[PDB]
């Protein structure tokens, strides 16, 4: 929070940049803290936290063009343009946070106004009582009823972060909207760790 909040006053002190880089490229996991910057109070720290989160999670993907976009309500969006160096070889993506659950569906069509090459990450503040079954049911309802991921522009996968972090991944393209493999794991690390070499096994994390 020191790094993420001291950069905010006037970004570009020529040491804050390096400190953000350290948060990206340090050994210590900060994924137990980064989802707490839903807004926090500044509303600019959203931008910084999303940058660090995506850049640390998407270490393996080669990022080239990141940009911060705003709406005049509660919707910090960030778009990312990267490529795949050596794995199924140019995708695009983005990330946005919400509150409780219904704020997601409320402006779901607005946040999408940025081949299904798009990837969307969604982070939802529900800081109470891990209930994985209920969470999964709630997400399945949206992904089974609403097919904006196919008809708007094409999103390959939709990943929900529940706030330590509890990831739930849903692909509304070909298979049933569920993923038992990457439960509690962000599938951005699917190339960092060679999980495709396990077709012959049934795995439990």
């Amino acid at each position: 929070e020191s790094i993420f909040l001291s950069a905010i006053d006037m970004y570009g002190h020529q040491f804050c940049i390096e400190n953000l880089q350290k948060l990206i490229l340090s050994e210590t996991s900060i994924f137990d803290v980064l989802p707490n910057f839903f807004y926090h109070s500044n509303q600019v720290v959203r931008m910084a936290a999303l940058e660090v989160y995506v850049r640390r999670a998407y270490i393996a993907y080669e990022l080239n063009s990141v940009q911060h976009r705003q709406l005049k309500d509660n919707t910090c969006v960030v778009e990312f343009q990267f490529m795949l160096p050596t794995s199924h070889p140019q995708r695009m993506g983005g990330m946005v946070s919400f509150r409780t659950f219904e704020d997601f569906v409320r402006i779901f069509d607005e946040v999408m106004g940025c081949e299904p090459i798009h990837i969307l990450n969604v982070a939802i503040k529900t800081d109470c009582d891990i209930e994985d079954d209920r969470l999964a049911a709630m997400f399945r309802e949206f992904t089974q009823q609403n097919k904006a991921t196919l008809v708007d522009h094409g999103i390959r996968r939709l990943t929900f972060l529940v706030a330590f972090p509890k990831f739930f991944t849903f692909r509304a393209r070909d298979k049933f909207e569920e993923d038992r493999i990457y439960r509690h794991l962000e599938p951005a690390l699917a190339f960092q760790l060679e999980l495709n070499r396990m077709r012959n096994f049934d795995l439990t994390a």
Binding site: A7, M10, Y11, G12, H13, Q14, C16, I17, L20, Q21, M47, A48, E51, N64, S65, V66, Q67, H68, R69, Q81
Partner: protein, 147 residues
């Protein structure tokens, strides 16, 4: 005027606009290699606007130009390159530390203007200070008048 200057100097889009003007005004006499590289680098900078890690690629522009100068074509292909790139050199030198450093530099320079005049009229009466200036700037009285 002050408020508008402060808003302008904190806008990340300023240095690239400057780059656009100085690069477009000189299309010829620039090697195609450096031209292409510069256009690419500034496009990347534009793509990263509104990001906490967004920084003006002054060093990278300087790097490609110094790479061509490291090749160092001789005999009228030397001087043409060093001269028709001077505007870019000035721009990158201004933004070595980013928009932050450039902002502080501008405001500091104005404060120095103040001191440049007002430290000469301390130490006594008007006419004495004027005579001091007259005896320093012997060969030009317009400087004295400006003070």
């Amino acid at each position: 005027w002050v408020e508008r200057l402060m808003k302008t100097l904190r806008d990340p889009s300023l240095p690239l606009l400057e780059l656009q003007d100085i690069m477009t005004s000189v299309s010829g006499r620039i090697p195609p290699n450096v031209e292409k590289s510069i256009k690419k680098e500034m496009a990347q900078y534009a793509s990263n606007i509104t990001s906490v890690l967004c920084q003006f690629p002054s060093q990278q522009i300087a790097n490609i130009l110094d790479s061509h100068a490291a090749t160092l074509n001789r005999k009228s292909e030397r001087e043409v390159f060093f001269m028709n790139t001077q505007s870019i050199v000035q721009l990158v030198q201004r933004y070595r530390s980013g928009i932050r450093g450039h902002m502080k530099a501008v405001v500091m320079d104005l404060l120095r203007q103040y001191l440049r005049v007002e430290t000469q009229f301390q130490n006594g009466h008007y006419d004495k200070c004027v005579f001091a200036l007259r005896e320093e700037n012997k060969s030009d009285m317009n400087t004295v008048l400006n003070y």
